[PDB]
């Protein structure tokens, strides 16, 4: 009677390439409206855009406390937030089978902030907590809009009354607000001199054997006015990043232009695609082809990338079926508008007794944006970075009622809150790193985003 | 049989876990501060592996105590930090290497003994270490089983007991014959 294993009801809407931005426009002002967008990227893992809004349940974690909210019921718990999330998903009594064309069939979608990692490891409290935005902000959705760029289909799915959800969607009208403007210049949380001091402290730990690689980040801040959704439309077109997202939260807006997949769980097949290695795009196409070859063959970058491959094998290996961990791709160069990135691919299999949420708990946060060994690297990041990372270098994604999951690393991600906008940029520090080159690489990764928003 | 893998808060430990499980071992992983020597006695492991990790053997929780207490009683393998800890537990000294080697492969030369039985010589291995066992300090009870191109200790074996360290990562994707190296420890 109650438990539902039945596939959701689906209405096919009109195909249009811009279907996700078109429909999301009318929802973008609503708390718990969320968009996962493939950035219109020419990319092997650019297939789906996903739209949700009007959750049946929400989970908000700030430190030790998770608030679970349903229509007329609010519960507070100090339990493991991913165990709480799994329990809430289970209690929805929606259990559809895997569908290759609908990777999210309802379920959980939202933000896992970097500081959620403090729930899984004991970390120091040196860096300042100056952004009040949840460590976890996840909605539970019994419907979704799926845009499939491979099949050119827009599917509206619902576990309830799909025709009522379609009527609700076509009843929302896009009333556009003032365009986005930055109302100050960008300022960093550190001078060139402070960056240098931190860099040199990382080198001391590398030589003492405390760590082998540390992701050290600075943060850009400006004031802004106007509509964050209009900024996202400009940025999405310029960035063409396959793990992009727009989250409207109760507290503010997350604008993600991430090119990076963290963890996919697709019918129990695990994939992670760490990005480790960067060079700027060059304007001369002959020079730029040379640049891609230089990255692929760089001894420094292949060392850093190998380390994070071995680390991601370990993180996935905490749960993977014995013998299932493989590296099908090592050191592939992917071009993005601003930069070439060096990417590797690790795969595995999830055991039947475990959940995607258990895989997320085992691995979070990404080795690619912390370092090795990970706990020591996160201790050093907290010691040297002046502020907590909050939403930046966490993950955005979904845990489908079918068991599927996909998550990003929130690099190239802006936090827009209380008329303040934040954008961070980091890089792997290793023994061969140079202080000035690593400072400059942080600017290389976000300069195009900072400059697009400045006019 | 049943292997206890002592985890020094490391990000390579579960690669050792996966390799031993693939070889057919039952493996329990415990952090270096999650176990007492009394708990180990209750688990009754057949063998113990001391994992890699940050910093030095002095920061490796129960690792030095486990090596001193189980040495000659159950087989012990030390990997990287575990290898350093094994040398230190019997009076060796851990010092900075001439050059840090972090995610770099090296050819090493060995004597085809202990975990190197049946392995190609030289062997290409991934390194993730800033520190080495000082050759001058190495206790008499250890033979050096393997050397780097610059004569750094890459492996040691106790001359009486099944107690062996390697400085490199057999479980790295770019290490040669890593499954067979660990299979030597599992099946001896
Ligand atoms: N690119 C993913 C979908 C996606 C877009 N943005 C994301 C952010 C997080 C997770 C997934 C996504 C796909 O094709 O399946
Ligand atoms: N931290 C020690 C051990 C590394 C492994 O384990 C070193 O840098 O040598
Ligand atoms: Cl906290
Ligand atoms: Cl200084
Ligand atoms: Cl990088
Ligand atoms: Cl090559
Ligand atoms: Cl970055
Ligand atoms: Cl443990
Ligand atoms: Cl020294
Ligand atoms: Cl050096
Ligand atoms: Mg780089």
XYZ file of C-alpha atoms and ligand atoms in Angstrom:
676
model
C 0.000 0.000 0.000
C 2.620 2.586 1.192
C 6.153 1.511 0.018
C 6.561 2.627 -3.633
C 8.987 0.670 -5.896
C 6.996 1.813 -9.019
C 8.921 4.059 -11.496
C 7.816 7.726 -11.157
C 5.188 9.148 -13.579
C 6.898 11.231 -16.344
C 5.589 14.060 -18.588
C 7.845 14.943 -21.558
C 7.995 18.765 -21.995
C 9.059 20.661 -25.137
C 12.771 20.097 -25.999
C 14.808 23.325 -25.823
C 18.585 23.396 -25.166
C 18.033 26.167 -22.548
C 15.153 24.276 -20.791
C 16.897 24.241 -17.379
C 17.719 28.000 -17.265
C 14.255 28.740 -18.792
C 12.284 26.837 -16.092
C 14.675 27.692 -13.244
C 14.345 31.456 -14.002
C 10.775 31.365 -12.579
C 11.938 29.494 -9.392
C 15.361 31.123 -8.700
C 14.060 33.442 -5.873
C 12.515 30.530 -3.863
C 14.414 29.096 -0.869
C 15.216 25.401 -1.623
C 15.010 25.931 -5.428
C 18.150 24.237 -6.796
C 19.722 23.796 -10.220
C 22.460 21.364 -11.261
C 23.674 22.524 -14.691
C 26.204 20.846 -17.064
C 27.252 24.341 -18.301
C 26.355 23.419 -21.931
C 29.910 21.934 -21.758
C 31.481 19.878 -24.597
C 32.627 17.217 -22.067
C 32.211 13.442 -21.481
C 30.220 14.096 -18.226
C 28.034 16.963 -19.496
C 24.648 15.265 -20.160
C 22.125 16.333 -17.467
C 20.673 19.495 -15.985
C 18.461 18.905 -12.906
C 15.867 21.291 -11.427
C 14.090 20.878 -8.066
C 12.078 23.186 -5.725
C 9.357 22.865 -3.000
C 11.017 20.129 -0.899
C 8.816 17.790 1.271
C 11.560 17.903 3.951
C 14.726 19.999 4.598
C 17.910 19.270 6.584
C 20.051 22.148 7.870
C 23.282 21.405 9.823
C 25.235 24.089 11.739
C 28.040 22.395 13.677
C 26.765 19.549 15.925
C 23.042 20.236 15.267
C 20.877 19.117 12.305
C 17.332 20.545 12.054
C 14.979 18.304 10.046
C 11.913 20.296 8.919
C 8.661 18.875 7.411
C 5.361 20.806 6.797
C 4.269 21.093 10.510
C 7.150 19.216 12.313
C 10.735 20.274 13.270
C 13.247 17.882 14.962
C 16.776 18.761 16.227
C 19.490 16.049 16.445
C 23.261 15.855 17.176
C 23.458 12.508 15.224
C 25.849 12.026 12.227
C 24.263 14.283 9.534
C 24.688 11.723 6.727
C 23.070 8.989 8.881
C 20.207 11.472 9.555
C 20.004 12.161 5.798
C 19.886 8.375 4.974
C 17.111 7.842 7.619
C 15.026 10.731 6.154
C 15.476 9.323 2.593
C 14.446 5.810 3.794
C 11.353 7.202 5.608
C 10.052 8.770 2.310
C 9.102 5.148 1.268
C 10.101 5.887 -2.365
C 12.356 3.115 -3.722
C 12.443 3.132 -7.541
C 14.854 0.977 -9.621
C 17.889 2.542 -11.391
C 17.039 4.263 -14.724
C 19.971 5.212 -17.048
C 17.863 8.156 -18.420
C 16.745 9.523 -14.993
C 19.859 9.510 -12.735
C 17.948 11.472 -10.034
C 14.400 10.162 -9.358
C 13.743 12.465 -6.445
C 15.698 12.236 -3.211
C 18.196 14.544 -1.499
C 19.818 17.516 -3.284
C 21.952 20.368 -1.943
C 25.127 21.543 -0.274
C 27.716 19.682 1.839
C 29.998 22.496 3.044
C 33.713 21.890 3.623
C 33.163 22.455 7.400
C 30.837 19.386 7.482
C 34.192 17.495 7.491
C 34.521 18.540 11.189
C 31.709 15.965 11.878
C 33.950 13.095 10.551
C 37.430 14.045 11.887
C 38.577 15.982 15.002
C 40.044 19.230 13.608
C 41.389 22.373 15.316
C 39.356 25.614 15.507
C 41.972 28.274 14.548
C 40.463 29.668 11.282
C 37.688 32.248 11.882
C 34.009 31.273 11.253
C 32.931 34.585 9.572
C 30.258 33.186 7.164
C 26.960 32.028 8.715
C 25.783 29.499 6.139
C 24.883 25.835 6.878
C 27.490 23.010 6.817
C 24.695 20.943 5.224
C 21.676 22.383 3.390
C 19.763 19.612 1.652
C 16.162 19.364 0.441
C 14.177 16.122 -0.033
C 12.270 16.271 -3.363
C 9.548 13.851 -4.617
C 9.819 15.256 -8.182
C 12.461 16.617 -10.560
C 12.898 18.242 -13.940
C 15.610 16.393 -15.921
C 17.126 17.936 -19.088
C 18.974 15.239 -21.114
C 21.371 16.739 -23.744
C 22.190 13.219 -25.132
C 18.536 12.227 -25.890
C 17.332 15.900 -26.314
C 14.439 15.256 -23.869
C 13.038 17.305 -20.975
C 11.343 14.970 -18.420
C 9.181 16.128 -15.500
C 9.011 13.208 -13.028
C 6.904 12.969 -9.870
C 6.208 10.200 -7.329
C 2.913 12.033 -6.695
C 0.637 13.827 -9.183
C 2.967 14.726 -12.078
C 0.198 16.738 -13.913
C -0.306 18.907 -10.752
C 3.503 19.546 -10.589
C 3.489 20.501 -14.314
C 0.542 22.921 -13.664
C 2.444 24.366 -10.617
C 5.564 24.876 -12.809
C 3.673 26.612 -15.682
C 1.863 28.838 -13.065
C 5.225 30.346 -11.812
C 5.987 33.545 -13.865
C 9.529 34.925 -14.333
C 9.457 38.537 -12.945
C 13.085 39.682 -13.473
C 14.843 41.861 -10.843
C 17.641 44.479 -11.178
C 20.803 43.101 -12.859
C 23.750 42.144 -10.649
C 26.382 44.864 -9.986
C 29.532 44.626 -7.844
C 29.449 47.732 -5.570
C 33.101 47.435 -4.371
C 36.428 46.181 -5.792
C 37.571 42.632 -4.993
C 39.843 42.416 -1.907
C 41.756 39.334 -0.712
C 41.829 38.039 2.904
C 45.667 37.994 2.572
C 48.448 40.266 1.198
C 51.173 38.829 -1.119
C 53.431 38.916 2.027
C 50.958 36.873 4.192
C 50.535 34.341 1.332
C 54.368 34.023 1.239
C 54.637 33.398 5.040
C 51.894 30.677 4.794
C 53.538 29.116 1.669
C 56.899 28.959 3.526
C 55.225 27.341 6.602
C 53.734 24.694 4.205
C 57.292 24.047 2.749
C 58.620 23.573 6.374
C 55.929 20.871 7.013
C 56.727 19.210 3.609
C 60.482 18.943 4.557
C 59.737 17.813 8.192
C 57.565 14.905 6.815
C 54.275 16.267 8.314
C 52.607 16.322 4.832
C 53.309 15.693 1.092
C 50.851 18.251 -0.395
C 48.606 21.034 1.028
C 45.924 22.977 -0.867
C 46.439 26.628 0.314
C 43.652 29.102 -0.647
C 43.003 32.855 -0.511
C 39.493 34.407 -0.554
C 38.248 37.414 -2.600
C 35.390 39.523 -1.129
C 33.259 42.337 -2.682
C 29.836 43.916 -1.991
C 27.094 43.488 -4.607
C 23.492 44.486 -5.343
C 20.899 43.002 -7.674
C 19.871 39.488 -8.688
C 22.333 36.566 -8.151
C 20.421 34.558 -10.841
C 21.368 37.191 -13.487
C 25.070 36.869 -12.413
C 24.796 33.046 -12.696
C 23.356 33.314 -16.287
C 26.435 35.452 -17.323
C 28.926 33.185 -15.472
C 27.425 29.852 -16.707
C 27.797 30.957 -20.382
C 31.434 32.138 -19.836
C 32.554 29.081 -17.721
C 30.983 26.092 -19.636
C 31.736 23.927 -16.532
C 30.113 20.484 -16.324
C 29.443 20.485 -12.497
C 27.863 23.951 -12.257
C 24.973 24.657 -9.824
C 22.752 27.419 -8.449
C 21.350 26.920 -4.932
C 18.845 29.349 -3.404
C 19.150 28.753 0.359
C 17.286 30.404 3.247
C 20.567 32.336 4.112
C 21.843 33.308 0.612
C 22.832 31.859 -2.792
C 25.603 29.492 -3.968
C 26.749 30.073 -7.565
C 28.947 27.096 -8.593
C 30.923 26.988 -11.886
C 32.806 23.808 -10.810
C 34.435 21.719 -13.559
C 35.149 18.954 -10.993
C 33.210 15.730 -10.206
C 33.853 14.473 -6.670
C 31.987 11.103 -6.468
C 29.491 9.440 -8.817
C 27.630 6.304 -7.677
C 25.745 5.021 -10.764
C 23.970 1.671 -10.215
C 26.679 0.888 -7.493
C 29.538 1.775 -9.947
C 31.744 4.407 -8.201
C 33.667 7.035 -10.174
C 35.835 9.900 -8.878
C 37.714 12.352 -11.148
C 40.210 14.378 -9.140
C 41.552 17.550 -10.784
C 45.177 18.110 -9.827
C 47.306 20.256 -12.175
C 46.631 23.573 -13.955
C 48.028 25.799 -16.737
C 46.367 28.946 -18.151
C 44.770 28.830 -21.620
C 46.900 30.829 -24.146
C 45.217 32.989 -26.854
C 47.395 31.648 -29.774
C 45.850 28.223 -30.690
C 49.293 26.703 -31.688
C 50.783 27.895 -28.330
C 47.641 26.597 -26.505
C 47.997 23.020 -27.984
C 51.661 23.099 -26.763
C 50.359 24.224 -23.302
C 48.055 21.118 -23.031
C 51.030 18.842 -23.929
C 53.257 20.650 -21.352
C 50.685 19.990 -18.574
C 50.250 16.274 -19.554
C 54.084 15.785 -19.362
C 54.924 18.105 -16.358
C 56.960 16.048 -13.763
C 55.789 18.343 -10.867
C 52.036 18.064 -11.839
C 52.169 14.260 -12.581
C 53.688 13.763 -9.045
C 50.915 15.886 -7.378
C 48.234 14.163 -9.501
C 49.593 10.636 -8.731
C 49.513 11.467 -4.981
C 45.796 12.455 -5.135
C 45.050 9.326 -7.280
C 46.618 7.115 -4.532
C 44.690 9.183 -1.901
C 41.315 8.821 -3.778
C 41.940 5.047 -4.158
C 42.308 4.998 -0.328
C 39.153 7.134 0.317
C 36.999 5.006 -2.034
C 38.813 1.859 -0.783
C 37.350 2.453 2.745
C 34.003 1.077 1.301
C 34.725 -0.421 -2.144
C 34.168 -4.113 -2.878
C 37.622 -5.826 -2.447
C 39.456 -5.884 -5.811
C 37.053 -3.365 -7.469
C 39.327 -0.245 -7.229
C 40.795 0.632 -10.686
C 42.431 3.639 -12.393
C 41.192 3.569 -16.040
C 42.567 7.101 -16.820
C 45.741 8.790 -15.517
C 46.766 12.389 -16.452
C 44.181 13.417 -19.108
C 44.147 17.172 -19.964
C 40.661 18.819 -20.116
C 40.463 22.375 -21.517
C 38.183 24.956 -19.832
C 37.761 28.637 -20.830
C 40.354 29.913 -18.259
C 42.666 26.876 -17.713
C 43.831 23.408 -18.772
C 43.301 20.866 -15.945
C 45.063 17.483 -15.390
C 42.367 14.926 -14.439
C 42.548 11.237 -13.434
C 39.693 8.729 -13.077
C 39.351 6.111 -10.290
C 36.472 3.561 -10.345
C 35.144 0.987 -7.867
C 31.995 -0.900 -6.774
C 29.756 -0.117 -3.751
C 28.799 -3.159 -1.629
C 25.078 -3.963 -1.394
C 25.049 -3.505 2.454
C 26.310 0.129 2.084
C 24.725 3.342 0.727
C 26.060 6.189 -1.424
C 25.717 8.306 1.791
C 28.264 5.928 3.498
C 30.687 6.469 0.535
C 30.271 10.255 0.901
C 30.932 10.003 4.695
C 34.065 7.863 4.087
C 35.596 10.321 1.533
C 34.438 13.842 2.548
C 35.934 16.353 1.926
C 37.798 15.778 -1.383
C 41.481 14.781 -1.258
C 41.975 17.015 -4.355
C 41.317 20.249 -2.304
C 42.931 19.200 1.038
C 46.182 17.248 0.502
C 48.023 14.206 1.820
C 47.873 12.860 4.408
C 44.362 14.353 4.475
C 43.795 14.841 8.269
C 47.239 16.478 8.707
C 46.633 18.665 5.589
C 43.201 19.821 6.978
C 44.941 20.671 10.326
C 47.500 22.809 8.425
C 44.771 24.484 6.263
C 42.896 25.451 9.504
C 46.215 26.770 11.025
C 47.130 28.988 8.006
C 43.878 30.008 6.200
C 42.479 33.059 8.083
C 38.780 32.023 7.638
C 36.861 28.753 7.392
C 36.063 27.681 3.814
C 32.327 27.097 4.514
C 30.618 26.292 1.134
C 33.905 26.559 -0.870
C 35.684 23.188 -1.550
C 32.722 21.279 -0.179
C 30.380 19.381 -2.517
C 27.043 19.961 -4.232
C 24.967 17.074 -5.475
C 22.192 14.539 -5.092
C 21.377 11.241 -3.413
C 18.578 9.732 -5.508
C 15.835 7.519 -3.984
C 17.146 4.839 -6.471
C 20.548 4.838 -4.651
C 22.429 6.893 -7.247
C 24.625 9.855 -6.224
C 26.631 12.548 -8.025
C 28.656 15.280 -6.337
C 30.964 18.125 -7.368
C 33.927 19.746 -5.629
C 32.850 23.398 -5.117
C 35.940 25.041 -6.608
C 35.127 28.064 -8.828
C 32.109 28.632 -6.536
C 30.791 31.938 -5.170
C 28.901 32.485 -1.883
C 26.434 35.428 -2.047
C 25.063 36.401 1.417
C 23.878 39.702 3.046
C 25.085 41.729 -0.025
C 28.653 40.207 0.321
C 30.061 37.895 -2.416
C 33.028 35.552 -1.777
C 35.186 33.635 -4.295
C 38.193 31.532 -3.181
C 41.136 30.137 -5.142
C 43.764 27.625 -4.069
C 46.507 25.367 -5.355
C 48.479 22.280 -4.329
C 51.735 23.182 -2.549
C 54.420 20.448 -2.966
C 58.229 20.397 -2.335
C 58.992 21.621 -5.937
C 56.383 24.477 -5.792
C 57.594 28.088 -6.229
C 56.060 30.801 -3.945
C 55.378 33.415 -6.708
C 54.129 30.821 -9.278
C 51.619 29.356 -6.723
C 50.388 32.874 -5.755
C 49.865 33.675 -9.477
C 48.108 30.305 -10.186
C 45.336 31.210 -7.636
C 44.589 34.337 -9.790
C 44.790 32.252 -13.034
C 41.963 29.972 -11.780
C 39.395 32.715 -10.894
C 40.554 35.938 -12.672
C 37.981 35.413 -15.510
C 35.158 35.057 -12.872
C 36.338 38.084 -10.780
C 36.691 40.221 -13.950
C 33.337 39.181 -15.485
C 31.503 40.291 -12.268
C 33.559 43.565 -11.907
C 31.833 44.923 -15.061
C 44.091 -15.371 8.021
C 43.030 -12.244 10.073
C 45.351 -9.186 9.672
C 45.282 -6.140 11.976
C 46.227 -2.988 10.022
C 47.154 -0.144 12.423
C 46.200 3.157 10.706
C 48.527 6.125 11.529
C 45.811 8.679 10.418
C 47.047 8.034 6.902
C 45.555 8.532 3.374
C 47.211 5.344 1.938
C 46.200 2.779 4.633
C 43.024 1.582 2.818
C 45.138 0.803 -0.331
C 46.917 -1.763 1.909
C 43.471 -2.888 3.100
C 42.229 -3.374 -0.498
C 45.390 -5.327 -1.595
C 45.287 -7.708 1.426
C 41.492 -8.241 0.958
C 42.018 -8.947 -2.803
C 44.664 -11.566 -1.781
C 41.957 -13.248 0.403
C 42.902 -11.898 3.892
C 40.333 -10.818 6.526
C 41.560 -7.341 7.499
C 40.625 -5.101 10.438
C 41.752 -1.437 10.308
C 42.137 0.442 13.627
C 43.585 3.881 14.272
C 46.799 4.094 16.313
C 44.797 5.577 19.296
C 41.626 3.363 18.959
C 43.230 0.163 20.389
C 45.193 -0.914 23.503
C 47.623 -3.912 23.570
C 44.897 -5.722 25.645
C 42.323 -5.199 22.792
C 44.849 -6.715 20.269
C 45.227 -9.793 22.549
C 41.374 -10.161 22.422
C 41.245 -9.797 18.558
C 43.947 -12.552 18.150
C 45.234 -11.325 14.750
C 47.504 -13.738 12.751
C 49.690 -10.782 11.523
C 49.980 -7.013 12.071
C 50.702 -4.291 9.521
C 51.870 -0.797 10.663
C 50.588 1.772 8.102
C 52.239 4.849 6.657
C 51.468 8.267 8.103
C 52.482 11.838 8.805
C 55.317 12.982 11.112
C 57.605 10.430 12.909
C 57.271 7.208 14.928
C 57.023 9.332 18.149
C 53.675 10.690 16.764
C 52.457 7.157 15.670
C 50.243 6.402 18.730
C 50.461 2.706 19.855
C 52.679 1.698 16.832
C 56.086 1.548 18.716
C 54.435 -0.331 21.697
C 52.823 -2.907 19.308
C 56.178 -3.535 17.529
C 58.038 -4.007 20.891
C 55.305 -6.325 22.323
C 54.519 -8.545 19.253
C 58.044 -8.682 17.689
C 58.838 -12.418 17.257
C 55.280 -13.435 18.412
C 53.227 -12.592 15.233
C 54.572 -11.489 11.821
C 54.745 -7.653 11.486
C 55.083 -5.624 8.281
C 55.884 -1.900 8.525
C 55.129 0.375 5.554
C 56.938 3.768 5.321
C 56.216 5.213 8.841
C 55.800 1.573 10.001
C 59.302 0.743 8.591
C 60.748 3.842 10.382
C 58.948 2.775 13.630
C 60.356 -0.791 13.386
C 63.950 0.598 13.098
C 63.297 3.076 15.969
C 61.710 0.402 18.278
C 65.099 -1.455 18.450
C 67.308 1.720 18.699
C 67.533 3.121 15.144
C 67.150 6.816 14.321
C 64.860 8.496 11.738
C 66.459 11.530 9.972
C 65.582 13.772 7.000
C 66.454 12.247 3.576
C 68.958 14.082 1.315
C 65.931 14.812 -0.991
C 62.158 14.507 -0.211
C 60.395 12.046 -2.575
C 56.605 12.744 -2.680
C 54.662 10.954 -5.466
C 57.955 10.126 -7.331
C 58.956 6.600 -8.504
C 62.562 5.307 -8.014
C 64.291 2.099 -9.093
C 65.442 0.206 -5.952
C 67.874 -2.748 -5.777
C 67.235 -5.656 -3.382
C 68.687 -9.074 -2.435
C 65.545 -11.097 -3.421
C 64.884 -11.935 0.263
C 61.862 -11.423 2.579
C 59.006 -9.577 0.802
C 61.323 -9.264 -2.313
C 61.310 -13.102 -2.930
C 60.418 -13.753 -6.562
C 60.392 -10.013 -7.467
C 62.241 -8.367 -10.388
C 65.510 -6.482 -9.532
C 65.675 -3.572 -9.813
C 62.052 -2.712 -8.840
C 60.328 0.674 -9.559
C 58.441 1.839 -6.406
C 56.489 4.979 -5.483
C 57.871 7.038 -2.585
C 55.949 9.423 -0.265
C 58.557 10.201 2.467
C 60.735 13.123 3.732
C 62.573 10.906 6.325
C 64.759 7.718 6.196
C 66.326 5.283 8.690
C 69.921 6.517 9.272
C 72.122 3.664 7.939
C 74.855 4.201 10.657
C 72.232 3.867 13.514
C 70.544 0.686 12.121
C 70.488 -1.965 14.907
C 72.521 -5.187 14.302
C 69.260 -7.272 14.480
C 68.245 -5.860 10.984
C 69.682 -6.603 7.485
C 69.080 -3.969 4.731
C 66.972 -5.812 2.090
C 66.776 -2.896 -0.391
C 68.586 0.353 -1.369
C 67.752 3.458 -3.444
C 70.110 4.705 -6.226
C 71.633 7.082 -3.526
C 72.121 4.222 -0.938
C 69.087 5.119 1.271
C 67.559 2.157 3.190
C 64.394 1.065 1.293
C 63.829 -2.153 3.271
C 64.886 -3.997 6.450
C 64.319 -7.507 7.792
C 64.967 -8.782 11.350
C 67.671 -11.487 11.185
C 65.686 -13.824 13.606
C 61.971 -12.797 13.405
C 59.250 -12.225 10.739
C 59.550 -8.425 11.169
C 59.997 -6.463 7.939
C 59.797 -2.829 6.797
C 59.684 -1.213 3.380
C 60.189 2.608 3.056
C 58.172 2.858 -0.228
C 54.492 2.115 -1.102
C 53.953 -1.268 -2.745
C 50.198 -0.377 -2.801
C 50.764 2.763 -5.045
C 49.327 2.453 -8.591
C 52.880 3.064 -10.079
C 54.732 0.542 -7.800
C 55.810 -2.661 -9.605
C 54.733 -6.101 -8.241
C 53.001 -4.604 -5.142
C 50.402 -7.403 -4.882
C 53.149 -10.067 -5.027
C 55.300 -8.200 -2.446
C 52.370 -8.183 0.018
C 51.460 -11.809 -0.978
C 54.999 -12.802 0.263
C 54.095 -11.361 3.705
C 50.558 -12.900 3.711
C 51.517 -16.477 2.602
C 55.124 -17.105 4.019
N 27.217 16.931 -15.262
C 26.349 15.999 -14.540
C 25.152 16.747 -13.895
C 25.547 17.877 -13.004
C 25.591 19.205 -13.335
N 26.038 19.943 -12.275
C 26.251 19.117 -11.212
C 26.676 19.411 -9.917
C 26.771 18.352 -9.043
C 26.524 17.040 -9.424
C 26.117 16.745 -10.705
C 25.938 17.803 -11.619
C 25.824 14.939 -15.512
O 25.833 15.087 -16.740
O 25.322 13.929 -15.023
N 56.114 11.058 7.513
C 57.200 10.068 7.337
C 56.655 8.696 6.909
C 55.926 8.748 5.590
C 55.188 7.478 5.175
O 54.640 6.747 6.022
C 58.156 10.627 6.281
O 57.848 11.720 5.699
O 59.190 9.966 6.023
Cl 31.807 23.835 14.278
Cl 59.288 33.710 7.595
Cl 45.302 22.349 -9.301
Cl 53.396 9.253 -20.641
Cl 40.696 26.693 -6.938
Cl 39.591 3.100 14.003
Cl 67.688 15.337 10.656
Cl 64.154 18.423 -1.440
Mg 48.986 23.423 -10.146
